[PDB]
Amino acid sequence: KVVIIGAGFAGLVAARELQTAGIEYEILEAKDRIGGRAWTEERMGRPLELGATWVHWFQAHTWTEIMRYGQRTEITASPSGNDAHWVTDGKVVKGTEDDLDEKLTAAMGVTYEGSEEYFPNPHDPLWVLSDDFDGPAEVRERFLSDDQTNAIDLVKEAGFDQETIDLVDAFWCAGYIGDPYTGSALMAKQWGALSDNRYRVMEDITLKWKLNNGMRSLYDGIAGDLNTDIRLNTPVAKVEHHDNGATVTTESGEVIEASAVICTVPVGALSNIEFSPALPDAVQSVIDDKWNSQGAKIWIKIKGHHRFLGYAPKPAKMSVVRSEYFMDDDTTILVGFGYDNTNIDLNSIEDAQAVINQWRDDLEVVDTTGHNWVADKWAGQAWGTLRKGQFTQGWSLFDDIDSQLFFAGSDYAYGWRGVCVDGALEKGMTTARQVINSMR
């Protein structure tokens, strides 16, 4: 009776929540697999995360699932103390990872600047615009202006030298997983607020601890709890939505009447669904302009054991590349993040070699792999990141649909929105509660 579109983390956790409340449901998933933009798969000789990878105990929703499904001690920190290399003036500069981190920490000071005023409760991101806001009006002015400024310009305007500008350029090419110059600096400020306003904590939360048994240990755990079979290979083509319910039509033409629809399809793939009535103009505007996520994630295998970290600014094929696994056959697997999925073939050895050649001529790529989420019609984006103006007139607009259609997914979370599974687990669960409370 409640139809959930998508068996990613948001749809799976929503289904479990409805099950707890005794509400009948059905999950319809387009692919022949569950997990969505979390996808653990054997490649290049071991399980690799083609999407979601890192977790932390300061992510409440993710951590509770880690505990629930037996993974409490099954996390491992990524390699640290790497030899670092960074782009600078079209030239490669060498240093320690600590040197690089010190420069990034200095720049984050200015990047986070108004977060203490904007986000006393970092899980109430739009408090500044609410009726409860009791601060100075200049705080609200600066909040709105920061939605229209990118994170690099904050560092430029503070007087940092070109080396730091190029370092933060590379950093935010990875963090916005897209062109950082089109992004909203408020996203970075909220990451600060959720990270105790410390660069080291932000990196601990988003870029340190990996699941030994993969994200699949969590998503298969949730699916294994469900008493209703997930309908795979069942893309939704149309959603009619009204005050008392909804009608879902599949690609095969099957019509399913529903008491509510929980739609977890990401913005990059919402164009595959016809909505009747059409979604509000303000929401359609976000869908047309989408979100800040045009980049890509690669895994590269090189000969030898090398503790490597590289940064390079836009328009590099990859902007952040780091050693992740030292393999038993004297190879290293590195992960990379880049701003433009169309400038790199994740499965081309020559392109992976070009990435490595950004910093070191003498390293030799023997394998490479990745999944181009942006070119995947059921995703159309990597993790959701915000363009200018989307912090205040973007993700939150998906909550005001005056009908039994509800949007859930990491890209609409209050907390670790888009970038983390924590946001999907948060928003799937709380949207199921919206449905539960309505029915009660």
Place this chain on the structure above:
Amino acid sequence: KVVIIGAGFAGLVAARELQTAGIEYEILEAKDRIGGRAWTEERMGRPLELGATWVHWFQAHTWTEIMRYGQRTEITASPSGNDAHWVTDGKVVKGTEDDLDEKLTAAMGVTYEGSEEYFPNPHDPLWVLSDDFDGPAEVRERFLSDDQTNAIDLVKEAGFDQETIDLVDAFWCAGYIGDPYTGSALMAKQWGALSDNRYRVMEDITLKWKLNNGMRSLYDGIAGDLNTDIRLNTPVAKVEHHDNGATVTTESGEVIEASAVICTVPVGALSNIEFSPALPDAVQSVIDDKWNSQGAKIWIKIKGHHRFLGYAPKPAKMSVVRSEYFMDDDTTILVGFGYDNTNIDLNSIEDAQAVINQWRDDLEVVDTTGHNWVADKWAGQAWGTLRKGQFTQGWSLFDDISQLFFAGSDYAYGWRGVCVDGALEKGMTTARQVINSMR
């Protein structure tokens, strides 16, 4: 079919988890109310937390419940910028809350000292004693030795002055909710590890954010999800757990058959239940020596609006007292924590006045209240804290029992005893143990 003893946070969340898995259960609760050691109740003109109070988004289990039950924006920070007072060599020193926080930050630096080596994953507290431990043998030796050292001695040995010693004494009288000199320093080191090894984070997590609608908004939310009525006024007197299945006998003599029993009764009340077979000897030794929680929590109402913070070392009636509410009739409600429940009558105006008189003879108590959990036969303790040796030979001995599983904040891996987070953690994971067994 699964019998859950106790309707505190652990038993409630375990019931919900079993319900999700389609497993029949029943909760038997001794009292006429749910919530256990979380208890939001109208007193002195407003809802006051007679047990659990503070929350944070870095507490995964608590925070997920806050999100689930609609309380995301319904948190408020306790008053700050108070005028601070501390007792040192029998004298009262005045200062700013900042001065006091700076002294405590300096002391926590040495208090947390080995936490980076012991607790890389702060949710695996016994990693050092495991077969996966791969550090130097001196790290294991230091870990074991630290279980036998109290947290104040670390500060004394580091050479801090008497003023800082008296401050940390007061602080740990509250934190150990009991005599800190009998406590295990590993507890404090794990708090550090769970708080990014920074005093300010540890205080933000445990002593800052209150629920506007009380802990009751969470425990009543969980109870409202349950499709099976909770049996109130139904104390369990006996638990049989031979390998057949299990049997529970109530005080009234009713016998209930069970596939498994999840017992959330805290150590301080476990002597009310007869277990057959007897619990393991090491568990019995913990029950006899109990846990580090003989203290008490008071709410004092004084005349006027006063931003007050006071610290005093053992054997003060209260060791940490802080303004919490400025009331509409020109009064202030303060909260206090003290190390010895038998040295204070939480409902005596004269005793509350003696507390205030530790620091300022000119403030006037007009009301006071509290619940002495230690003298409550269904608790017998405040929040669970560790005596020397109980970090490595205490809380973890209650796992793997007989088929009776123990769940409760006092056995959690993370924010054990001190936080609702630990009850929600361990109630949920113990239900998962039962689920997995049945699957």
